[PDB]
Amino acid sequence: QPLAKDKVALLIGNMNYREHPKLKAPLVDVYELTNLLRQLDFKVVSLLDLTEYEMRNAVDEFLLLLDKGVYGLLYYAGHGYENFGNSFMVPVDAPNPYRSENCLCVQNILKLMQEKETGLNVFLLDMCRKRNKVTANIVFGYATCQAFEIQHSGLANGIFMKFLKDRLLEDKKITVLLDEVAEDMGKCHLTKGKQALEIRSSLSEKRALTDPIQGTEYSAESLVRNLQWAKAHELPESMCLKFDCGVQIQLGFAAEFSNVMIIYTSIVYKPPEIIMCDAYVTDFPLDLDIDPKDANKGTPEETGSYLVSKDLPKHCLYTRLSSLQKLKEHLVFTVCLSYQYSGLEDTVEDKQEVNVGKPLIAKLDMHR
Numbered sequence: 322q323p324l325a326k327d328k329v330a331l332l333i334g335n336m337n338y339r340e341h342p343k344l345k346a347p348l349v350d351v352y353e354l355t356n357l358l359r360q361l362d363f364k365v366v367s368l369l370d371l372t373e374y375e376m377r378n379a380v381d382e383f384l385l386l387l388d389k390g391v392y393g394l395l396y397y398a399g400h401g402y403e404n405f406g407n408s409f410m411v412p413v414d415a416p417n418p419y420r421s422e423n424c425l426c427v428q429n430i431l432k433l434m435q436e437k438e439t440g441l442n443v444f445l446l447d448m449c450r451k452r453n454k455v456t457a458n459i460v461f462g463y464a465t466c467q468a469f470e471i472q473h474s475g476l477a478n479g480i481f482m483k484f485l486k487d488r489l490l491e492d493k494k495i496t497v498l499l500d501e502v503a504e505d506m507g508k509c510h511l512t513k514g515k516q517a518l519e520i521r522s523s524l525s526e527k528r529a530l531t532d533p534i535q536g537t538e539y540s541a542e543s544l545v546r547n548l549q550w551a552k553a554h555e556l557p558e559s560m561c562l563k564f565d566c567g568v569q570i571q572l573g574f575a576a577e578f579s580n581v582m583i584i585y586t587s588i589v590y591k592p593p594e595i596i597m598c599d600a601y602v603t604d605f606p607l608d609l610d611i612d613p614k615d616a617n618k619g620t621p622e623e624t625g626s627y628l629v630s631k632d633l634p635k636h637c638l639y640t641r642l643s644s645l646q647k648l649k650e651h652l653v654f655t656v657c658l659s660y661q662y663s664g665l666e667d668t669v670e671d672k673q674e675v676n677v678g679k680p681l682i683a684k685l686d687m688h689r
Contacts, residue, residue, distance in 0.1 A: 323528045324535035325440055326390030328363040329550060331383035333410075334578075335399030337370050340417035344449060345477035346469040347398040352577065352628050354396060354482065357489050361530050363394060364551045366682065367578045368646060372414040375646050376425050378688045384430075386550060388543055389438040390535065392528075394445070395430075398467065398479065401448025408463070410446070419451065434459055441528045443495060447481045458528060460495050461521040462502075466512050476627065480511060481518070492531040496522045549684045553579050557652075557677035564658050564671050567592035570600045572656065572675065573637070577628045579682040580645040583621060585637035586656065598660040602640050603672075605654045608647040616640040648683040651676050 332354055334347030348369070355367040368379060380395070387393050400411035402419045409424035416423060427446065434442050435457050443460045449467035464481035472478060484505040488498045499520045506512045539547055556574045563569055569590035575583040586600050601617045617638045618624045624641035626633075633639070657672045 323440070323526060323532045324390075325392040325532045326388065326535050327386075327537055327547070328361065328392045328394075328534060329383070329386045330358050330363040330365045330394040330396070331379060332358075332365065332367045332394075332396040333371055333376065333379065333399070334367075334369050335371065335397075335411065335413050338400065338411075338413050338415070340415065341400055341411070342449075344399060344467070346467065346479035346482070347447075348628070349476050350398050350447065350479045350482040351396070353486055355578070357486060358394065358530075359554070360490065362534060363392075363530075364547075364554075365579075366550060366553050366685075368580045368682065369578045369643065370413045371646065373412040373423055373425070374688075376410065376412050379646070380425065380430060382546075382550075382685055382687045384433055384437075385546055386543075387434070387437040387439050387442065388540070390440040392441040392530070392532065393434075393437075393439055394443040394530070396445045396447070398447040398482075399449070401446065401450050401465070401467075403450060403452045408446070408448075410448070418453070431459065431461065441495065441524070441532075443530075447479060456523060456525055458525070459521070459523050460499065462499055463519045463521075464506075464517060465519075466506065466515075466517040468511055480506065480509065484509075489530060492529055494524075494527045494529055496520070496524050498529075545686070549686060552684045553681050555681070555684075556582070557680050560675070561589060562656055562673060562675070564660075564673070566595060566658075566660055566669070566671065568595060568598050568600075568658060568660060570656055570658065573634065574677070574680070575629050575633055576681060577626065581641065581643045582645060582680055583624065583626050583629065583633065584640045584642065585634065586617075587634070587637045594663055596661050596663040598658060600656060600658050601638060603655045603657055605642070606648060606650060606652065608649060609642055609644050610647070611640075611642070645680065646682045647689065648679065649689050651678055652680055652683065 334351035336344045402409040408427040445462040447464045450465045469477045484502045503518045560572045571589045573585045
């Protein structure tokens, strides 16, 4: 039986491009792949809309986890670029036209992966393409069909992921699964008789994503890095804030991605002596680049949140923090309360600062 020393994954989805067409499929595809891999015991970091610097730093931190016998999986969905036999991943801040120096070279990552002694290393690219001795056990999948499908929900789903999600949970050698995905796509009307998937493999043994985790036992200087990566899925716990007037505010947290978190607030208790009160969140760290006109909304959809609406309580005010990878310090923000005493005309203001630590991606000690 093949064993994994540990299972680690990094998934990046780029959609909202400054100078290039916006993509739709990376949103749901990264969200669904994150859940699928977590089911298989991978410690996953998922990131949406990264700049050049952010992409390079996240890839470097992931590469650092690839110790002897470890199973790694790296997934990128977004714009891609091809130039003189080399392929490149395009970050959201890339200027138009495309330049190599602004992008991440796939061949250079493959080269760094080839120096690891991984039990398995799966590198999958799902790109919207444009032109103008000791085994590392690398399996490289390169789909150039990134084209999508609209669901009953109105959400976009990708072609490579549609076939992948139906096969990924099976206890079969990874290369055998990918050959089936290539056949599925070859029969699919959108990709029939076209260069849609290229698979490269240097896998000498029967390894699968379903393989159990071995004598994990980290090491001395791999310890902190791994504990931080394992904790990047942990939400801040719910909190109930008490104000001197007696009004109690509940603060809740939900996650779409490792760098996208939703904060919700509601008035849980209003004393009889208080006629009217309202609560709102403000003064977030500058690095997050929020804008008060996008915070404290009546519905999750108004903040740009559509993935976790079933897990979000109704009748709250919602705020979406989609740039958490930019956070270099504790997430400290203010809960403001406006209130009025029954029989009095004046509106009283009160406020308190909340520290929710370094949530999700902020747990990592990466370059920022």
